[PDB]
Amino acid sequence: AQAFVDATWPQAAKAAQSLGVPAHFLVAQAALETGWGKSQIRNKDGTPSYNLFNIKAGSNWTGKVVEARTVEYENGQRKVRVERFRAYDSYEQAFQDYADLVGNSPRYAKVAGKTDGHAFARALQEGGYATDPSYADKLARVINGNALRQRLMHH
Template sequence: MAAVDFIKKLAPGAQKVQKKYNVLASLVIAQGCLESGFGASDLSKQAYNLFGVKGTYNGKYVLMWTKEQDKHGNESRVQARFRKYPSYAESLADLGSLYTRLSRYKDVVGEKDYQKATAAVAKGGYATDINYATKLNSIIFTYKLTQYDNLDDLPEEPSEPETPTGPEYPSKEYDGIDMPLNQHLPSDVDFPQLHVSSKDGKDVIEITGVSVDFTADPTGKKSFSFTLSRTQENATEFEQLVVDNILYLDEKKYNHQKYYITNVSLHQENGMLTKTVTAAHIFSVLLINNRIEKTVSKKLGIKEALDIALKGTDFKYV
């Protein structure tokens, strides 16, 4: 497909991304062109995946060979899951959603100067190429992509009721005002998947290529562990694996919610950094480990009993 034709194909979806996520259409189009080779890459042909996003989309993925480097620049080829989208539109929207979810891209959202926007993308670590912003700027300038940043002529779309595209996992947890505490998880999460987030529940990132060792003992404590080696492609999620950050594990299978990271062991061998991570279910951390040893001999109402049981934890109830 000719470059100009490819750009025209992406433009309407990129403008919708700008309108919904406040990320410049010119930036989105340029990234689509650069990352997919103007639609020539196998990933974009097989999975409509324009931006090389790993993981699954509504449970769909394709396996592709990819190169990974250690900190010494040594390359190895590995097979990885990449999201498979039904069309380019979902791939474009997923990029816009990514920029609004991750705080390291906060300078991308709302930026009206495309050169500052591309610089922010590069600074946020989207790619390891030191010339990444320059390449994006060149595509935007060469093909006059800023013309698509003007949304004045973009027609208004009729509002339609949203319909769920997959199972509603993880389970809803309520903070007393009918608002799920897990609202920062991507809406398209379809477990089994493993995600890590900061303690405040933001910056949710999928972790791929790990095997989880899950255990549950008779006292109700549930935990799991896994080992992950650091590569250039998983650097962001690797750095998020620290004590007290949150992991979301395979809710569809285990019907569980959040797990807090309780221990992280760092190992280095032959220049490769590896973390062994242990995480405990939120119930184990907040209730069992912090249980109040107090005996009450009188009759209690529901509210009084829950106030005692949940005192000192992050749990609230309705």
């Protein structure tokens, strides 16, 4: 969606500079995570969580949460459960929380500063960002894809 890129790019820009990566890398990751906004986690009322990166609550997370169905892979096994996800006041808060997490967790140290889409996606995957085995491949295709590119120039 164009509305998705328009709503996220400004907030992506701020967090992207904290991480030393192009803003559209973060828009692409959010688009992959939420199906261009069509599958973003929402409250029971249908209120948006703004959690475009699908970040679960940590054990000591205090603040808004939403219980949501989630799919995870462990070995060649598919898992479906309901977990507590973070909820935010705005896309800005969501992006800032993402930069905080990725920027400060040791396992993602190789992510910051990556300005090639494949290298960025691989660093995330190798850091354990996702359980989907083809996460990096899929993310790289969005980052370098014509769909995102056209929507960016439109933005």
